[PDB]
Design a protein around this ligand. Structure first.
Ligand SMILES: [Mg+2]
Ligand SMILES: [Mg+2]
Ligand SMILES: [Mg+2]
Ligand SMILES: [Mg+2]
Ligand SMILES: [Mg+2]
Ligand SMILES: [Mg+2]
Ligand SMILES: [Mg+2]
Ligand SMILES: [Mg+2]
Ligand SMILES: [Mg+2]
Ligand SMILES: [Mg+2]
Ligand SMILES: [Mg+2]
Ligand SMILES: [Mg+2]
Ligand SMILES: [Mg+2]
Ligand SMILES: [Mg+2]
Ligand SMILES: [Mg+2]
Ligand SMILES: [Mg+2]
Ligand SMILES: [Mg+2]
Ligand SMILES: [Mg+2]
Ligand SMILES: [Mg+2]
Ligand SMILES: [Mg+2]
Ligand SMILES: [Mg+2]
Ligand SMILES: [Mg+2]
Ligand SMILES: [Mg+2]
Ligand SMILES: [Mg+2]
Ligand SMILES: [Mg+2]
Ligand SMILES: [Mg+2]
Ligand SMILES: [Mg+2]
Ligand SMILES: [Mg+2]
Ligand SMILES: [Mg+2]
Ligand SMILES: [Mg+2]
Ligand SMILES: [Mg+2]
Ligand SMILES: [Mg+2]
Ligand SMILES: [Mg+2]
Ligand SMILES: [Zn+2]
Lengths: 49, 116, 144, 111, 154, 53, 101
RNA sequence: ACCGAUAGUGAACCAGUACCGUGAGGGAAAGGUGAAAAGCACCCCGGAAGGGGAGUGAAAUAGAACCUGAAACCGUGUGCUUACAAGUAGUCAGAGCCCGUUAAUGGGUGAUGGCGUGCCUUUUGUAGAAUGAACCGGCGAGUUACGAUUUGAUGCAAGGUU
RNA sequence: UAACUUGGGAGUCAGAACAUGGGUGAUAAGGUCCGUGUUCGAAAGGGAAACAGCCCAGACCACCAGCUAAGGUCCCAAAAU
RNA sequence: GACAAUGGUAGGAGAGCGUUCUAAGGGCGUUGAAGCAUGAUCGUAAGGACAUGUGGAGCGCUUAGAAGUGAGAAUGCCGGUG
């Protein structure tokens, strides 16, 4: 293989999902958190258990 | 590495403004209100492509009614007669015939009347 | 393929008609006249242009109502001043201003658009049997 | 043939300057001079000096005949604004725009 | 970040009554000159793979060279003094491409110094062989002793 | 009271339709030929009504 | 003389030498196409199909296989963060009518 | 595989300065002529400012916070249009007039007709007379570290791995 | 033509009207609380003047083609004076 | 070739566009780069070219890598201007 023709193994890599970057993505605005409540808050959510 | 805002923003906004060319005042000038109007324009155009078929069929029908009345026949009875005669010329063609050559339309009217 | 004919001022021909109101029912005469004024009887009818014909209505004073409309059909108007309602019965209006009676009945059957107003301007109503438009050479028109 | 003169950063608001420019736009040079002399506005003398400078370089730089010249163009563009403040009641300050004008006069012989 | 930017301690104006948006520090992220939200922070990007996979990678790069015919075995480099021009001539006589990786059994001072200034020529030892160098090179020029040593190691 | 909506350029310029000044009321001085205000002394020559002022 | 032809789920009134635009036909530019569904023949001699005039044909030459002007189909539903933008160019065939019958 | 003048230090510049506070203390804005200063002799209008020539220069349309020079916003001219009309300002249809392009079943304008109560947020439900935004520009929000788990990938395999 | 099991990721826990079976209220409420269905929510298009929740009907895109639904056919305004 | 599906909020899944930087390869540029402006251009979308003017020295393209990667709203911050 050549440094100008590198190719990872099929299925080894997947682009990470970025939230809060517009409506078309489906994760804009509330960024997958839904609306309001404790679980919608930065640092929100109860202790495990 | 840092990615500064750069040129993409201006390029995108300018595209929207150019699409807003011709609009009144601020609506062809300011990106926010131009964007809003271009959205409304898209929605209106989608709706009106469908409404236009309705509109032109309505026009054709009105003209056919006027021609039939000139031949002492109602639009409704003329369409029933043409159907029973097996003639499939559509409203747009019927209107254009009625406008352009009255004798052809008169022969069609007689075909309808015979069928009835 | 787009092929629908569109009338325009270069190819529109407006004729003049005379219609006799005597012994005719107000609303029925009115609807027909409105059709004529809008040009709905022409095969070149085109919605965005005036393809209609001119109409003279004679003998407006001899128009007739059914039922008790003569005393019970009331025309109301408002002067845009507080308490400024004024009314006139259809019979009284026929006695005192039949031209307005016919005009208003017909114009209520035309659209409230710039074109509608223009088309309604092609109506001429006269209470008697004479009209001043012999120069326009109008033809008698039979209703229905 | 055309001659131009510009007075840049005159400390008069462009709205005000343009009130007077609207009087002389498109007129003959002598009539314009008279209008400017007999018009009682702050910008009239400044505009008059611009017009006379334009006539002067028409004659000197381009050997144009000054008695046949017309004010072909006259306009005021916005110069940079001096930002000032006025103390108002209750410790507040409110802005003051001391606006300036770039005044252009162009005269032409029409040929 | 907002903690790191200088100043910012006080509330810039009272919570209520002034008509302004509420603010807690002039160094908040939406303020010009404010602290940065997240951003780069010093860290390493290095990671490890299993040793068998490292060895497999080295073998795969060498095998790719051998199958592409970019493998040339030389008897030895008999350089007594460094001479870039002699080494350039040696490359030319061997008819090598622009990018050459030269492999010696052990550190060969004079070969390294002679090849050092030639663009596209890299010199390494059998122990120092690595995937980036092998892959970057268009041809490998390896001495016989180096080739045997590499064979032993891998 | 305050403006409920800002004033468009169109509306402002319509309002300014009549905001302007006029050419002064001036005529040529019969003495020196320079323009003067009617019924005023001519400042160029100081003449009025065929006499010096 | 004119004819009513049926093509691309539509009907078109055509005269000889007229240029017409229709739904994409399966033909090459330069070829001759034959419309075999003639509903009506007008002019000097009138023929009324019921529905089609038997044996009547209209021949034409294929001038172009084009794509119509771009339409931007855009829709949205306010307050729902929901919109859709698509492009469209409708294929068409341009022909010139050579002969009726 | 750090920033590149709203970034990077608060501070690229005479900055812990100016400025604010009794004080402890708080705390900015502000970079770019040109290769060379060759930084516009001289003439002209003007008190000056400013300008028009002339000249230097590849360029002054590089002339002093002098590379580039977007938008808001302010002007001048003009092709089409508008003083009987009820307008979320467009859209679909459409004469007339004026043009002539990345040459495409072109471009600008728009008599007149149909349809049509912004956007965001928040709501059972918002044209809403609920919230937010004067406009324009820039800046402005799921990141990284270390653990856990799961999935994909790869090596080796009763072994795998430091 | 689904159904179930195991595992990764969620959101939701303010609901509304209409019809109908009921409690409460006064066989009051666009009231309130349950049962059943539909629609809205998250649904544009046609009708009901306008009118989330009613009636018809579920928009992949284009067409100046045809048949129908509810509802309509004197004129506004398509179709029976 | 056939014929089946393709309204949609919270939300799940997938495929992509564009920005800066890096590596390798291959290219452009004072016979004029980026940027800016204009245009009747191309693609199913994000978006991509071409021409001309301005500008005056840097910048694409391909494959892969990495992120301070995309704004219209926060009575958001700063500047400019209504
Ligand atoms: Mg997801
Ligand atoms: Mg994805
Ligand atoms: Mg969704
Ligand atoms: Mg979620
Ligand atoms: Mg929220
Ligand atoms: Mg909630
Ligand atoms: Mg929740
Ligand atoms: Mg930005
Ligand atoms: Mg339909
Ligand atoms: Mg306020
Ligand atoms: Mg900073
Ligand atoms: Mg950088
Ligand atoms: Mg800059
Ligand atoms: Mg600072
Ligand atoms: Mg600084
Ligand atoms: Mg500059
Ligand atoms: Mg008028
Ligand atoms: Mg939004
Ligand atoms: Mg509420
Ligand atoms: Mg509001
Ligand atoms: Mg609130
Ligand atoms: Mg407000
Ligand atoms: Mg802004
Ligand atoms: Mg209730
Ligand atoms: Mg309740
Ligand atoms: Mg229920
Ligand atoms: Mg809801
Ligand atoms: Mg609905
Ligand atoms: Mg309706
Ligand atoms: Mg569907
Ligand atoms: Mg009708
Ligand atoms: Mg769908
Ligand atoms: Mg960002
Ligand atoms: Zn005098």
């Amino acid at each position: 293989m050549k440094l100008h023709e590198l190719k990872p193994a099929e299925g080894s890599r997947k682009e990470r999902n970025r939230v809060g970057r517009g409506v078309a993505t489906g994760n804009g605005k509330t960024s997958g958190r839904g609306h309001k409540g404790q679980k919608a808050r930065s640092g929100g959510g109860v202790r495990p258990g | 590495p840092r990615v500064k805002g750069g040129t993409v923003t201006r390029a995108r906004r300018k595209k929207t403004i150019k699409l807003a060319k011709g609009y009144f005042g601020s609506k062809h000038t300011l990106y926010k209100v131009a964007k809003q109007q271009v959205m409304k324009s898209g929605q209106y155009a989608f709706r009106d492509r469908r409404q236009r078929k309705r509109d032109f069929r309505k026009l054709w029908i009105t003209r056919i009614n006027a021609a039939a009345r000139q031949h002492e026949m109602s639009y409704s009875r003329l369409m029933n007669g043409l159907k029973k005669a097996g003639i499939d010329i559509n409203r747009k063609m019927l209107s254009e015939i009625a406008i352009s050559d009255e004798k052809a339309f008169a022969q069609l009217v007689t075909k309808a009347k015979d069928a009835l | 393929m787009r092929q629908t004919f569109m009338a325009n001022e270069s190819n529109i021909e407006r004729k003049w008609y005379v219609i006799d109101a005597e012994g005719q029912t107000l609303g029925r005469l009115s609807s027909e006249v409105a059709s004529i004024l809008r040009g709905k009887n022409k095969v070149t009818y085109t919605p965005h242009v005036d393809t209609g014909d001119y109409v003279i209505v004679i003998n407006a004073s001899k128009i007739e109502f059914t039922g008790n409309k003569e005393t019970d059909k009331v025309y109301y108007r408002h002067s845009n001043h507080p308490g400024g309602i004024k009314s006139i019965t259809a019979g009284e209006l026929r006695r005192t201003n039949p031209e307005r009676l016919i005009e208003n009945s017909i114009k209520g059957m035309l659209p409230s658009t710039r074109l509608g107003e223009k088309q309604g301007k092609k109506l001429f109503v006269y209470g008697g049997a004479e009209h001043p438009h012999a120069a326009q050479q109008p033809e008698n028109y039979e209703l229905r | 043939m055309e001659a131009k003169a510009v007075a840049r950063t005159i400390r008069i608001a462009p709205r005000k300057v343009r009130l007077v420019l609207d009087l002389i736009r498109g007129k003959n040079a002598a009539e314009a001079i008279a209008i400017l002399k007999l018009t009682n506005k702050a910008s009239s003398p400044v505009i008059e000096k611009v017009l006379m400078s334009a006539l002067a370089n028409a004659e000197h730089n381009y050997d144009m005949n000054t008695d046949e010249l017309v004010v072909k163009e006259a306009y005021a563009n916005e110069g940079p604004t001096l930002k000032r403040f006025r103390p108002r009641a209750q410790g507040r300050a409110s802005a003051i725009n001391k606006r300036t004008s770039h005044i252009t006069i162009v005269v032409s012989d029409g040929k | 970040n907002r903690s790191a930017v200088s100043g910012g301690g006080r509330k810039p104006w009272k919570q209520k009554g002034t008509g302004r948006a509420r603010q807690g520090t002039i160094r908040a992220p939406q303020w010009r000159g404010g602290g940065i939200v997240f951003g780069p922070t010093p860290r390493s990007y290095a990671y490890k793979m299993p040793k068998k996979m490292r060895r497999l990678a080295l073998r795969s790069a060498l095998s790719f060279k051998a199958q592409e015919n970019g493998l040339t075995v030389v008897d030895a480099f008999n350089f007594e003094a460094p001479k870039t021009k002699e080494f350039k001539n040696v490359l030319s006589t061997l008819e090598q491409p622009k990018k050459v990786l030269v492999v010696t059994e052990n550190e060969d001072v004079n070969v390294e110094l002679s090849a050092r200034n030639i663009p596209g020529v890299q010199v390494t030892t059998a122990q120092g062989l690595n995937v980036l160098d092998i892959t970057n090179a268009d041809s490998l020029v390896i001495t016989e002793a180096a080739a045997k040593k590499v064979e032993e190691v891998l | 009271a305050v403006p409920k909506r800002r004033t468009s350029k169109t509306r402002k310029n319509k309002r300014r339709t009549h905001f302007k000044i006029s050419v002064p009321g001036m005529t040529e001085c019969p003495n020196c030929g320079e323009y003067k205000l009617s019924h005023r002394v001519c400042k160029n020559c100081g003449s009025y009504n065929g006499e010096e002022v | 003389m004119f004819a009513i032809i049926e093509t691309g789920g539509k009907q078109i009134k055509v005269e000889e030498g007229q240029e017409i635009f229709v739904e994409k036909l399966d033909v090459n530019e330069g070829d001759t196409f034959t419309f075999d569904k003639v509903l009506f023949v007008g002019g000097d001699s009138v023929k009324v199909g019921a529905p089609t005039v038997e044996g009547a044909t209209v021949t034409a030459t294929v001038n172009k296989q084009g794509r119509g002007k771009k339409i931007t189909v855009f829709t949205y539903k306010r307050r729902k963060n929901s919109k859709r933008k698509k492009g469209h160019r409708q294929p068409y065939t341009k022909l010139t009518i050579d002969k009726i019958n």
